[PDB]
């Protein structure tokens, strides 16, 4: 008996059906948590290839015909690869080497977006910014950003206080090392009673050799102090020791007195 046959209309694929995961390394890498990145139809044999390329993601079968998507679950970026730069958000691992650019057979590893807005880098950078590995740009920006730490929760705030105690202990031993001169400077720019108090504590803890070399404006000689009583203005306004001093090594009292010298219109000294 005859049958009324009819073929369906020709298929018209959408953008999703034409997606190829092997072309989307720059689409998948910036993906965030709770975000589905559709990658199109994926054959069964290419599932391990995709899952090993993106271990931080879960491969989800979203629709028929093998339609799949990737959902970021975590960030596996390590401190030495994420903390010593502010511009690299991810990197690729292949044959034991680390590269900024993608290559077939590599494994994606991504950094937390807030890795420098929290204290997740304080431990690694506390050691890296000492000694020969000191990078002036990265380390100054690290210390400076800690003062305006965007993580204002009780945890980001507490990690900030833990870092201050470590820097206070370290810089009390020697405040001349570059990371400590930067910490003293940023305390000065913060301009609070706590930061000023920590400055005086660190500088007063220094050795006699440090004070004789850098803090002669704070500790004048007998003849210098006795002569300064003959003038009405503060000693810091005329003392050559204070005009040649490193402002990061001045006690808070001396630093405040430097801005009380009555500058005549123009240059007043």
């Amino acid at each position, epitope marked *: 008996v005859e049958l009324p046959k009819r073929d369906p209309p020709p298929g018209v694929p959408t953008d999703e059906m034409l997606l190829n995961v092997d072309k989307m390394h720059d689409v998948i890498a910036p993906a965030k948590l709770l975000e589905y990145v559709h990658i199109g139809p994926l054959a069964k044999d290419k599932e391990d290839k995709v899952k090993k390329r993106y271990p931080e993601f879960r491969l989800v079968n979203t629709g028929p015909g093998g339609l799949s998507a990737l959902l970021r679950q975590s960030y596996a970026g390590t401190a030495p690869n994420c903390c010593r730069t502010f511009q690299r958000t991810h990197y690729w691992k292949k044959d034991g080497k680390i590269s900024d650019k993608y290559e077939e057979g590599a494994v994606l590893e991504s950094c937390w977006p807030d890795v420098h807005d929290t204290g997740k880098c304080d431990v690694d950078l506390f050691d890296w910014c000492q000694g020969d590995t000191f990078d002036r740009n990265i380390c100054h920006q690290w210390i400076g950003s800690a003062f305006n730490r965007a993580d204002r929760t009780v945890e980001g705030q507490q990690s900030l206080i833990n870092l201050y105690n470590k820097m206070q202990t370290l810089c009390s031993k020697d405040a001349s090392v570059p990371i400590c001169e930067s910490f003293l400077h940023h305390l000065r720019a913060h301009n609070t009673e706590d930061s000023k108090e920590m400055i*005086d504590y660190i500088l*007063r803890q220094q050795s006699a050799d440090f*004070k004789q070399k850098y803090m002669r404006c*704070s*500790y*004048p000689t*007998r003849d210098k*102090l*006795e002569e*300064s*009583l*003959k003038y*009405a*203005e*503060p*000693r*810091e306004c005329w003392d050559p020791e204070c005009s040649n001093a490193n402002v990061n090594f001045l*006690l808070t*009292r001396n630093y*405040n*007195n430097l801005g*009380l010298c009555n500058i005549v219109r123009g240059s007043g000294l």
Partner: nanobody
Amino acid sequence: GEVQLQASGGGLVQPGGSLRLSCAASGIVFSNNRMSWYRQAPGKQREVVATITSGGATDYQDSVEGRFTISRDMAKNTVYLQMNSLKPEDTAVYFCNARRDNFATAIYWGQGTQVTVSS
């Protein structure tokens, strides 16, 4: 005559204690002078310990920096010297001193008070 700079507040205290010295000036206005606390150990020249300008800026001797603090009260016209963490080498006679801003000849010295620290 009648330029009085009497110092008080001294005494005897074990090393580690504290003293607050006073100097209520008369015949002299602080908004016009620089006040300075001196001290003189037995058989030794006088040395300045702390000072304060007519504007209020302070300065200290290095061996007392952080331990001593010099303040002023413009209303009471009295200059103070808070002494903390007194070390045995602080034993001396502490006295007031007033020096005009630009009138150098008008300098005045005060009557000291005894500060002694020992066991």
